Amino acid sequence: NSIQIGGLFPRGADQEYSAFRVGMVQFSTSEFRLTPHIDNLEVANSFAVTNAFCSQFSRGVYAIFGFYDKKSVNTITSFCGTLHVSFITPSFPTDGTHPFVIQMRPDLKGALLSLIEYYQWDKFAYLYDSDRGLSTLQAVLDSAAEKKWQVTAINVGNINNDKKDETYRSLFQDLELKKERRVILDCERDKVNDIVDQVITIGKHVKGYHYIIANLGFTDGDLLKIQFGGANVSGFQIVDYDDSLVSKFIERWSTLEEKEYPGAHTATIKYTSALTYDAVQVMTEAFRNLRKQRIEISRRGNAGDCLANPAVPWGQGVEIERALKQVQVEGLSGNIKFDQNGKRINYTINIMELKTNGPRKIGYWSEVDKMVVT
Amino acid sequence: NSIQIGGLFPRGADQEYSAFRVGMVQFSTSEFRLTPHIDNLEVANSFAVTNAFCSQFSRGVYAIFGFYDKKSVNTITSFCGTLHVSFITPSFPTDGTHPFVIQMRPDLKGALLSLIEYYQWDKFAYLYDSDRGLSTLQAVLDSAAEKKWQVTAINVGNINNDKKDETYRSLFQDLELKKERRVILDCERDKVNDIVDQVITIGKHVKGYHYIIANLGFTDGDLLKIQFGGANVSGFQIVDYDDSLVSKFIERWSTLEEKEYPGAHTATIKYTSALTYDAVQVMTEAFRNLRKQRIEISRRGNAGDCLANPAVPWGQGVEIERALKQVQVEGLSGNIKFDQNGKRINYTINIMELKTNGPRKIGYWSEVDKMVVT
Amino acid sequence: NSIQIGGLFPRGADQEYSAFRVGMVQFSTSEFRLTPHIDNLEVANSFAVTNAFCSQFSRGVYAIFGFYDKKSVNTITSFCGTLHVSFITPSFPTDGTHPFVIQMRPDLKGALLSLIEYYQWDKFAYLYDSDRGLSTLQAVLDSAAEKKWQVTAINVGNINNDKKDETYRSLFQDLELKKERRVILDCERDKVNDIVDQVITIGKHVKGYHYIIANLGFTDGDLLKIQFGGANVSGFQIVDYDDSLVSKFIERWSTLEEKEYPGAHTATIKYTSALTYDAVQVMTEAFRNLRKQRIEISRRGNAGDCLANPAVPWGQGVEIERALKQVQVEGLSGNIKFDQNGKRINYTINIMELKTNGPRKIGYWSEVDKMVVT
Amino acid sequence: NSIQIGGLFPRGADQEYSAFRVGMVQFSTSEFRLTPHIDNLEVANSFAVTNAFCSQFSRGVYAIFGFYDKKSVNTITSFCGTLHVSFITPSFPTDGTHPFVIQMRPDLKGALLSLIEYYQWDKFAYLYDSDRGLSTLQAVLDSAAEKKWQVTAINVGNINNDKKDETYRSLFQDLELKKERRVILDCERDKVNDIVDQVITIGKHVKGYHYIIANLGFTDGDLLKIQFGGANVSGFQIVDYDDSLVSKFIERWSTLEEKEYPGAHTATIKYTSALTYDAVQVMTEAFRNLRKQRIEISRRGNAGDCLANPAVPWGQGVEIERALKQVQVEGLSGNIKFDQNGKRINYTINIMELKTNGPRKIGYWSEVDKMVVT
Ligand SMILES: *[C@@H]1O[C@H](CO)[C@@H](O[C@@H]2O[C@H](CO)[C@@H](O[C@@H]3O[C@H](CO)[C@@H](O)[C@H](O)[C@@H]3O)[C@H](O)[C@H]2NC(C)=O)[C@H](O)[C@H]1NC(C)=O
Ligand SMILES: *[C@@H]1O[C@H](CO)[C@@H](O[C@@H]2O[C@H](CO)[C@@H](O[C@@H]3O[C@H](CO)[C@@H](O)[C@H](O)[C@@H]3O)[C@H](O)[C@H]2NC(C)=O)[C@H](O)[C@H]1NC(C)=O
Ligand SMILES: *[C@@H]1O[C@H](CO)[C@@H](O[C@@H]2O[C@H](CO)[C@@H](O)[C@H](O)[C@H]2NC(C)=O)[C@H](O)[C@H]1NC(C)=O
Ligand SMILES: *[C@@H]1O[C@H](CO)[C@@H](O[C@@H]2O[C@H](CO)[C@@H](O)[C@H](O)[C@H]2NC(C)=O)[C@H](O)[C@H]1NC(C)=O
Ligand SMILES: *[C@@H]1O[C@H](CO)[C@@H](O)[C@H](O)[C@H]1NC(C)=O
């Protein structure tokens, strides 16, 4: 027995594929082993995304895995919902409910707002980038209207990095003269590293400057540059480096080689790779459950073409989606459990603030409870 | 000759299709004829959009006309950029550069910011609809950050129609608590009509209030019910009914036997339908120029399917794009001129206010010259 | 044992006929039956009213039910008082005393004056209509003369359906010039609805104003429009919807169909039709009382001619009149009891105010007690 | 050359009948005679009015002359407008356009308001009655609202004569409490006589108190009872006794005995009787016009009854109306010219003021020209 699955990875995602492969070899069951097809492409390109999706659908896959960007989330969700093909992804949650999509990255708007309230902020600057959607920006603006916050939102995606050296100085001087020492960096890791590099270059990390990084990879990026800068630096993390599961996984990970497993000869892993490991775990758990329920979702023939009119759905896909959204498993990113929509629930987000000795967990955040200080 | 094009009209777009037929029957001549294949679909469904798009592509069409939405713009842009097939649309301009896309709606961020500066505002509210995009919201937020404004951004897109009566009342009660006198409505015609109805019901159209309708169709709405309220109302208009071309078009549009041409037997025309008429005009002009240039654009049924692997485009696409972007003609929207990215330049937006004797054009806005008061 | 009665209804008053039939079937048979002749006409045309009255009298009817207007009240009064034929009517009470006429509508002049005194008005406006007489206008003027008020009486009746908007806008502009915020509407349902639409259009339903609907049909109008404006809206109501009889009737009435009972599928009921129902009850009770007294009212022969000279009145008409004015029952309007002149006594008018949550009763008015607050 | 006309007169009208007979003998042309039938009846009884009208129509009359009051005007107007029978009346004009009715009494609201403005009045009192229509009161109130007047309107037509002492004493005490030295008496002859008697009794007829008699007959009342005292007393006059025609008529009028011509041997004639004489003149000359036009209008006892179903008119009656309403003559009232409605157009109202010596003309009022001074 073997279930065919599809894999989508961007051009430059080596650690994610390495983590997927280690997860496959780890939770591979002798009763049934997944046969994954891996397609490398430009995740921003919707044409390439739909090409790969239709190729996988023609191959007759039961659960598609892969990433999506701001420019392909719509087509991915639309094709999955119309064709009843389950999609598992560690990318940003969709801006609203979307069937047949398994969002494994927990929402961070709640944790970010709780951290702002805990720090008791009234006015700050929101440095955002349109790469993970503007849902966090909308949530911040709505909460600012509710709580009477003086938030100044500045976009950094549109400015070309060539000419974006004087505008950084201008807006930083504006913040300094307005005493806007509180900033939030809602950007991808590369953009966050670029922004903090410019911050150190311009010397805008003096005492009083409280930086908040709105991503789950706080330690995954570079923090040794502002370790002793005397600036309040905070962030969030979904993977805990203390529990036994992640400890043993990291041992088995750093004991690997960087030749056949790129991006695996270190101790610090990315939350995307950890969530891909967790996705392998949830996939094998749900397929095992479906097999144990005496349901053979195996399609007799090929699924056909995606474009073929009228749409060609299949109830085995709905069954696979139902099995996917009914799994409760412990993993690297914490407790894994989903709603009927596909979003992730029952999760804990560890909050840490950078100090001179290093980042240290100042507490944890969940959904059933507000921010907790540890 | 006979050149075949495509159509992606939405399901519920009748006036735009009527304007399309009117433009076809007017600009049609003995030189050549335009044979379109019109598909009525859900512009929000990317799967349906893809089906229609490469259905027309397999039909071997030369250019495509239609609409899109924030949930399907990326699919259209990627498909056109990859298959080199042009796409003329009256929908919102794409947030950035996209080749083989001709956008007929002029940008409104610059005109709106100029109008706000002319009115000398410092604390106002911005009611935006997430179902259409947030480019204008991003622009106004950046300007406020660079000009020290107090913008209260409130989303009115998630408001369902089952209880969209108390929601607006509570929203405006909160605005009154915040002492908000000036409001900017960045919504479509139906949404702004609902907001105006709620404003009138809760009696918030009295003297001392200001409203700015952030859309090109100022006179498209039922603006008569708020005309006698006594509150400042400002907006933008793209079609000048006092122009000879617009008057001559209306002279035939008002007597079009509405049963045959839906939404025609009236003196007002929505800016989307006006841009559809202008799109027919510009397509005819571009094809006439291309043929009169001694260029062979013969194409047979060799297009294949949109998901061909590898996807080889046709060489006539770039020449059609160049011919389409080199058109300088006059229409209902005014002067029509495109840049190297497909966006419109050398255009004029008429800023209007609402008075007790009807709307009046106080001035005009341009991209080379800022707001001008007459 | 069939008792012959008559019926006059206007061309457009169908809910009143529906309520008449509902009462006719509610008290169908106790010890006899009632046989009505229904005649529809223009109630404001005295010739048609006389023709119908003469035809019904020639048909040998015992009592007559029907409406009248300011230009047809005198004819009905004179014919009834000379031919000794009773006339039960829900129309406006006659400006004086008149025999053989039963006026079901309670007087509103006392309640209106008491409400004005309770609100402590000194300067206000009085929008009257030349539709139901100017008796209330004369009473208000006399009271103002005796209490040192400043009444601005304006007629809103002599306007056509071609410049109503302009006329009302000019009237309220003059009202603003005089700085009058307190307004009284002596109009009926349609006229007050038009005035409400116009005042909403000009934006004068906001806080700082006060309107009194001087008619018993407070909730019968469309008060949903001004319920959220923030201005006081008072009124009067004769049917008490949270009663026992009223609730039972509304349950039995909202279940009917508009196909067979026009205007009889709603949770509300106009006071005219309610008084029609109570008139049916009153006539049935009066004839049951006459049967209990064992008096033969059967005519010796044909009634004769309506315009007979000399006019000889049948003596049994006086007994019919006494039975009509002697009955005392409880219905929708409340305690129904008449005096020697046919007017209503021992009645109660429920004063209502239009709050945001809805029209809430604030007290009741009687003839032996002044306005009582609860 | 033999025409039947109908006559309606109140039970107690003598001078009007005498003037009717005077006009009949004075215009008894040898070409044709107008044989009248006189019906004496209580004009305030709509049934009696209808009976007489139906009898006259049944015998086939061509025109009807008579009077009415506020309780019998609608019956006459409706019956005339339905059966197409002309009706000449010196009574008060109807408050609108009523066909087939000739109103020889000129309106007085315009002259009254012109006199008020010429006397420079801002606050005064207006004592009226409900026995001659409320059109003058409505006009006074509308003009007061337009010109910022303070008018005290008090109705004195609802009181009896035994309680008149106390009622009028309280009324004049209230007038003194407002210091009302300027009053307008829009009442009938008996009412104004009682008013002036009570004024003399209280002693308020001293200089300073200004009285205006709002009727055309300022010689019929006790013009000498209140003449002494120096009090301003004004009034109107439609008859001019200095005119040659009026003097020649009254020269015979005085010589006529009282036996067969009641109320004739006097130097003063009521304006109602003057309008009766003018009515005889106008019907006679209109029938001369009809006879000279070569038109046969022969009617006899064949018109049937008034209550015929369906009520069919008789055609040449509209020709009677056209002859009546499209003519101009000279009479006691002056120039007699009617419009398409039936009201006078080119009347000249004279204005009289009272001193201790007696009445004296002040000026004249016309429809095209305002108050005139001499
Ligand atoms: C950077 O991190 C340090 C870590 O201690 C922060 O120090 C303390 O931060 C808290 C809250 O962030 C401050 O409490 C505040 O006190 C003021 C009264 O001065 C009160 O009005 C506020 O509502 C809030 O409770 C606390 O004062 C501050 N200092 C100490 C010694 O505890 C610091 O605030 C962080 N930010 C910056 C810009 O330094
Ligand atoms: C609705 O539109 C009217 C247009 O008349 C607005 O009136 C504006 O009121 C402001 C008051 O702040 C005026 O500004 C003043 O300008 C003078 C001269 O520069 C300056 O000395 C004052 O200190 C003040 O700044 C403004 O001139 C005036 N508009 C015009 C055209 O004169 C009204 O405010 C608008 N309503 C709302 C709610 O925005
Ligand atoms: C509308 O209603 C309010 C509240 O009842 C009125 O305000 C009151 O006015 C009276 C004078 O008549 C004062 O004595 C009270 O103090 C006021 N407040 C309250 C809470 O009663 C108001 O006058 C009414 N009319 C208008 C035009 O606003
Ligand atoms: C009554 O008549 C007298 C004289 O005809 C009026 O007396 C003067 O009228 C003028 C008119 O504008 C006033 O300016 C004077 O002040 C009046 N003088 C006096 C002593 O009264 C008088 O106004 C008329 N009306 C009344 C009510 O007396
Ligand atoms: C803009 O359009 C107008 C009208 O066609 C034209 O006269 C003008 O030259 C254009 N401007 C430029 C810069 O081409």
mmCIF file of N, CA and C in Angstrom, chain A residues 32-105:
data_model
loop_
_atom_site.group_PDB
_atom_site.id
_atom_site.type_symbol
_atom_site.label_atom_id
_atom_site.label_comp_id
_atom_site.label_asym_id
_atom_site.label_seq_id
_atom_site.Cartn_x
_atom_site.Cartn_y
_atom_site.Cartn_z
ATOM 1 N N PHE A 32 2.308 1.503 4.954
ATOM 2 C CA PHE A 32 2.144 2.295 3.737
ATOM 3 C C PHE A 32 3.144 3.442 3.783
ATOM 4 N N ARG A 33 3.837 3.670 2.673
ATOM 5 C CA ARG A 33 4.825 4.736 2.584
ATOM 6 C C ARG A 33 4.429 5.712 1.484
ATOM 7 N N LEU A 34 4.413 7.000 1.819
ATOM 8 C CA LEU A 34 4.027 8.014 0.852
ATOM 9 C C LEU A 34 5.036 8.085 -0.287
ATOM 10 N N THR A 35 4.524 8.290 -1.498
ATOM 11 C CA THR A 35 5.358 8.450 -2.685
ATOM 12 C C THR A 35 5.260 9.895 -3.153
ATOM 13 N N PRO A 36 6.106 10.794 -2.656
ATOM 14 C CA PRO A 36 5.942 12.216 -2.976
ATOM 15 C C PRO A 36 6.649 12.635 -4.253
ATOM 16 N N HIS A 37 5.963 13.412 -5.085
ATOM 17 C CA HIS A 37 6.584 14.065 -6.228
ATOM 18 C C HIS A 37 6.908 15.503 -5.848
ATOM 19 N N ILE A 38 8.145 15.919 -6.092
ATOM 20 C CA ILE A 38 8.620 17.240 -5.699
ATOM 21 C C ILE A 38 8.798 18.093 -6.945
ATOM 22 N N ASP A 39 8.161 19.261 -6.955
ATOM 23 C CA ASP A 39 8.243 20.192 -8.074
ATOM 24 C C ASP A 39 8.791 21.516 -7.568
ATOM 25 N N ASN A 40 9.907 21.953 -8.142
ATOM 26 C CA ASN A 40 10.528 23.222 -7.794
ATOM 27 C C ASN A 40 10.156 24.277 -8.826
ATOM 28 N N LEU A 41 9.777 25.455 -8.343
ATOM 29 C CA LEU A 41 9.215 26.495 -9.195
ATOM 30 C C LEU A 41 9.333 27.833 -8.472
ATOM 31 N N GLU A 42 8.773 28.877 -9.078
ATOM 32 C CA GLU A 42 8.679 30.196 -8.458
ATOM 33 C C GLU A 42 7.293 30.300 -7.837
ATOM 34 N N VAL A 43 7.240 30.269 -6.503
ATOM 35 C CA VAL A 43 5.959 30.195 -5.805
ATOM 36 C C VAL A 43 5.132 31.451 -6.026
ATOM 37 N N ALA A 44 5.778 32.562 -6.385
ATOM 38 C CA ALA A 44 5.035 33.784 -6.668
ATOM 39 C C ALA A 44 4.319 33.697 -8.010
ATOM 40 N N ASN A 45 4.865 32.923 -8.947
ATOM 41 C CA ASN A 45 4.302 32.837 -10.288
ATOM 42 C C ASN A 45 3.054 31.964 -10.308
ATOM 43 N N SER A 46 1.891 32.594 -10.484
ATOM 44 C CA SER A 46 0.634 31.855 -10.459
ATOM 45 C C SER A 46 0.521 30.885 -11.627
ATOM 46 N N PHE A 47 1.092 31.230 -12.785
ATOM 47 C CA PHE A 47 1.065 30.314 -13.922
ATOM 48 C C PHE A 47 1.814 29.027 -13.604
ATOM 49 N N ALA A 48 3.021 29.148 -13.050
ATOM 50 C CA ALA A 48 3.771 27.957 -12.662
ATOM 51 C C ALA A 48 3.048 27.191 -11.564
ATOM 52 N N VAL A 49 2.424 27.911 -10.628
ATOM 53 C CA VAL A 49 1.701 27.250 -9.546
ATOM 54 C C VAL A 49 0.564 26.400 -10.098
ATOM 55 N N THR A 50 -0.241 26.960 -11.007
ATOM 56 C CA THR A 50 -1.364 26.191 -11.539
ATOM 57 C C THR A 50 -0.882 25.088 -12.474
ATOM 58 N N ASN A 51 0.241 25.304 -13.166
ATOM 59 C CA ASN A 51 0.818 24.237 -13.978
ATOM 60 C C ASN A 51 1.181 23.038 -13.113
ATOM 61 N N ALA A 52 1.894 23.283 -12.012
ATOM 62 C CA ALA A 52 2.263 22.197 -11.112
ATOM 63 C C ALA A 52 1.033 21.555 -10.484
ATOM 64 N N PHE A 53 0.044 22.366 -10.101
ATOM 65 C CA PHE A 53 -1.167 21.817 -9.501
ATOM 66 C C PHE A 53 -1.876 20.885 -10.474
ATOM 67 N N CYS A 54 -2.014 21.299 -11.735
ATOM 68 C CA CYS A 54 -2.700 20.449 -12.700
ATOM 69 C C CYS A 54 -1.882 19.206 -13.024
ATOM 70 N N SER A 55 -0.551 19.323 -13.048
ATOM 71 C CA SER A 55 0.276 18.136 -13.255
ATOM 72 C C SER A 55 0.073 17.128 -12.130
ATOM 73 N N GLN A 56 0.084 17.604 -10.881
ATOM 74 C CA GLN A 56 -0.153 16.713 -9.750
ATOM 75 C C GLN A 56 -1.543 16.095 -9.817
ATOM 76 N N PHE A 57 -2.555 16.897 -10.157
ATOM 77 C CA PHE A 57 -3.917 16.377 -10.222
ATOM 78 C C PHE A 57 -4.055 15.324 -11.314
ATOM 79 N N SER A 58 -3.420 15.549 -12.466
ATOM 80 C CA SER A 58 -3.405 14.540 -13.517
ATOM 81 C C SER A 58 -2.683 13.278 -13.077
ATOM 82 N N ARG A 59 -1.626 13.409 -12.274
ATOM 83 C CA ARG A 59 -0.960 12.241 -11.718
ATOM 84 C C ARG A 59 -1.816 11.507 -10.693
ATOM 85 N N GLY A 60 -2.871 12.137 -10.185
ATOM 86 C CA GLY A 60 -3.767 11.488 -9.249
ATOM 87 C C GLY A 60 -3.234 11.431 -7.833
ATOM 88 N N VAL A 61 -3.007 12.596 -7.230
ATOM 89 C CA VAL A 61 -2.520 12.700 -5.862
ATOM 90 C C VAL A 61 -3.714 12.850 -4.932
ATOM 91 N N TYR A 62 -3.514 12.497 -3.663
ATOM 92 C CA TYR A 62 -4.584 12.532 -2.677
ATOM 93 C C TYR A 62 -4.443 13.681 -1.689
ATOM 94 N N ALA A 63 -3.225 14.168 -1.468
ATOM 95 C CA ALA A 63 -2.990 15.298 -0.573
ATOM 96 C C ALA A 63 -1.785 16.061 -1.104
ATOM 97 N N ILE A 64 -2.013 17.271 -1.583
ATOM 98 C CA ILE A 64 -0.950 18.094 -2.142
ATOM 99 C C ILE A 64 -0.294 18.889 -1.025
ATOM 100 N N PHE A 65 1.035 18.895 -1.017
ATOM 101 C CA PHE A 65 1.814 19.686 -0.079
ATOM 102 C C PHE A 65 2.595 20.729 -0.860
ATOM 103 N N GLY A 66 2.751 21.898 -0.270
ATOM 104 C CA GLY A 66 3.520 22.943 -0.914
ATOM 105 C C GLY A 66 3.256 24.291 -0.283
ATOM 106 N N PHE A 67 4.053 25.262 -0.708
ATOM 107 C CA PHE A 67 3.945 26.621 -0.211
ATOM 108 C C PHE A 67 3.128 27.462 -1.183
ATOM 109 N N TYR A 68 2.657 28.608 -0.697
ATOM 110 C CA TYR A 68 2.054 29.606 -1.564
ATOM 111 C C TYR A 68 2.446 30.992 -1.077
ATOM 112 N N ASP A 69 2.398 31.948 -1.994
ATOM 113 C CA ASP A 69 2.767 33.330 -1.737
ATOM 114 C C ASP A 69 1.519 34.204 -1.784
ATOM 115 N N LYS A 70 1.731 35.518 -1.685
ATOM 116 C CA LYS A 70 0.620 36.453 -1.802
ATOM 117 C C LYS A 70 0.025 36.442 -3.205
ATOM 118 N N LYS A 71 0.807 36.041 -4.204
ATOM 119 C CA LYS A 71 0.366 36.044 -5.591
ATOM 120 C C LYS A 71 -0.173 34.698 -6.060
ATOM 121 N N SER A 72 -0.195 33.681 -5.196
ATOM 122 C CA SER A 72 -0.689 32.371 -5.601
ATOM 123 C C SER A 72 -1.634 31.755 -4.577
ATOM 124 N N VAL A 73 -1.862 32.413 -3.442
ATOM 125 C CA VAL A 73 -2.781 31.877 -2.444
ATOM 126 C C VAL A 73 -4.182 31.749 -3.027
ATOM 127 N N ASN A 74 -4.612 32.752 -3.793
ATOM 128 C CA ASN A 74 -5.966 32.745 -4.331
ATOM 129 C C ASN A 74 -6.173 31.580 -5.290
ATOM 130 N N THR A 75 -5.246 31.391 -6.231
ATOM 131 C CA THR A 75 -5.398 30.294 -7.181
ATOM 132 C C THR A 75 -5.271 28.942 -6.490
ATOM 133 N N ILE A 76 -4.372 28.825 -5.508
ATOM 134 C CA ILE A 76 -4.223 27.558 -4.797
ATOM 135 C C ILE A 76 -5.519 27.192 -4.087
ATOM 136 N N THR A 77 -6.074 28.131 -3.315
ATOM 137 C CA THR A 77 -7.299 27.839 -2.578
ATOM 138 C C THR A 77 -8.474 27.598 -3.517
ATOM 139 N N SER A 78 -8.566 28.361 -4.610
ATOM 140 C CA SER A 78 -9.675 28.180 -5.539
ATOM 141 C C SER A 78 -9.624 26.806 -6.194
ATOM 142 N N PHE A 79 -8.446 26.403 -6.677
ATOM 143 C CA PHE A 79 -8.322 25.085 -7.288
ATOM 144 C C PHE A 79 -8.582 23.975 -6.279
ATOM 145 N N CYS A 80 -8.054 24.104 -5.059
ATOM 146 C CA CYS A 80 -8.290 23.070 -4.056
ATOM 147 C C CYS A 80 -9.770 22.951 -3.719
ATOM 148 N N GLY A 81 -10.446 24.082 -3.510
ATOM 149 C CA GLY A 81 -11.857 24.040 -3.178
ATOM 150 C C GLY A 81 -12.719 23.504 -4.300
ATOM 151 N N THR A 82 -12.398 23.857 -5.545
ATOM 152 C CA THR A 82 -13.207 23.382 -6.659
ATOM 153 C C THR A 82 -12.959 21.908 -6.959
ATOM 154 N N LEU A 83 -11.708 21.456 -6.893
ATOM 155 C CA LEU A 83 -11.352 20.096 -7.267
ATOM 156 C C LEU A 83 -11.371 19.128 -6.091
ATOM 157 N N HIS A 84 -11.697 19.602 -4.889
ATOM 158 C CA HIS A 84 -11.744 18.766 -3.690
ATOM 159 C C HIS A 84 -10.418 18.041 -3.471
ATOM 160 N N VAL A 85 -9.325 18.789 -3.590
ATOM 161 C CA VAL A 85 -7.981 18.277 -3.355
ATOM 162 C C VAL A 85 -7.396 18.990 -2.146
ATOM 163 N N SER A 86 -7.027 18.213 -1.131
ATOM 164 C CA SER A 86 -6.518 18.772 0.113
ATOM 165 C C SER A 86 -5.135 19.372 -0.101
ATOM 166 N N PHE A 87 -4.885 20.515 0.534
ATOM 167 C CA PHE A 87 -3.608 21.208 0.444
ATOM 168 C C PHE A 87 -3.085 21.449 1.851
ATOM 169 N N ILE A 88 -1.862 21.003 2.114
ATOM 170 C CA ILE A 88 -1.218 21.191 3.409
ATOM 171 C C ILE A 88 -0.062 22.161 3.234
ATOM 172 N N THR A 89 -0.031 23.202 4.061
ATOM 173 C CA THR A 89 0.945 24.263 3.860
ATOM 174 C C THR A 89 1.359 24.923 5.170
ATOM 175 N N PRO A 90 2.647 25.200 5.354
ATOM 176 C CA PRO A 90 3.095 26.009 6.494
ATOM 177 C C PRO A 90 3.173 27.504 6.221
ATOM 178 N N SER A 91 2.650 27.975 5.091
ATOM 179 C CA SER A 91 2.694 29.392 4.768
ATOM 180 C C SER A 91 1.656 30.152 5.590
ATOM 181 N N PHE A 92 1.497 31.430 5.269
ATOM 182 C CA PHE A 92 0.617 32.286 6.047
ATOM 183 C C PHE A 92 -0.825 31.796 5.942
ATOM 184 N N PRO A 93 -1.608 31.899 7.014
ATOM 185 C CA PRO A 93 -3.024 31.532 6.929
ATOM 186 C C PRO A 93 -3.763 32.427 5.949
ATOM 187 N N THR A 94 -4.746 31.838 5.274
ATOM 188 C CA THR A 94 -5.543 32.581 4.314
ATOM 189 C C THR A 94 -6.410 33.614 5.022
ATOM 190 N N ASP A 95 -6.640 34.736 4.340
ATOM 191 C CA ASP A 95 -7.460 35.822 4.878
ATOM 192 C C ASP A 95 -8.935 35.428 4.781
ATOM 193 N N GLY A 96 -9.324 34.518 5.663
ATOM 194 C CA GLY A 96 -10.672 33.991 5.700
ATOM 195 C C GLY A 96 -10.688 32.482 5.560
ATOM 196 N N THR A 97 -11.878 31.925 5.773
ATOM 197 C CA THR A 97 -12.052 30.483 5.667
ATOM 198 C C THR A 97 -11.915 30.030 4.219
ATOM 199 N N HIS A 98 -11.241 28.899 4.026
ATOM 200 C CA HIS A 98 -11.038 28.324 2.697
ATOM 201 C C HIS A 98 -11.005 26.806 2.824
ATOM 202 N N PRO A 99 -11.965 26.106 2.226
ATOM 203 C CA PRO A 99 -12.021 24.648 2.368
ATOM 204 C C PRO A 99 -10.851 23.958 1.681
ATOM 205 N N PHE A 100 -10.566 22.742 2.151
ATOM 206 C CA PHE A 100 -9.545 21.867 1.570
ATOM 207 C C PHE A 100 -8.153 22.485 1.635
ATOM 208 N N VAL A 101 -7.925 23.359 2.610
ATOM 209 C CA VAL A 101 -6.606 23.920 2.872
ATOM 210 C C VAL A 101 -6.298 23.720 4.348
ATOM 211 N N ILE A 102 -5.124 23.170 4.637
ATOM 212 C CA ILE A 102 -4.696 22.888 6.000
ATOM 213 C C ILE A 102 -3.623 23.904 6.365
ATOM 214 N N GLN A 103 -4.020 24.959 7.069
ATOM 215 C CA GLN A 103 -3.094 26.003 7.493
ATOM 216 C C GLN A 103 -2.399 25.541 8.766
ATOM 217 N N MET A 104 -1.099 25.280 8.672
ATOM 218 C CA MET A 104 -0.330 24.837 9.825
ATOM 219 C C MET A 104 0.391 25.969 10.544
ATOM 220 N N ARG A 105 0.448 27.155 9.961
ATOM 221 C CA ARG A 105 1.075 28.229 10.716
ATOM 222 C C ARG A 105 0.033 28.947 11.553
#
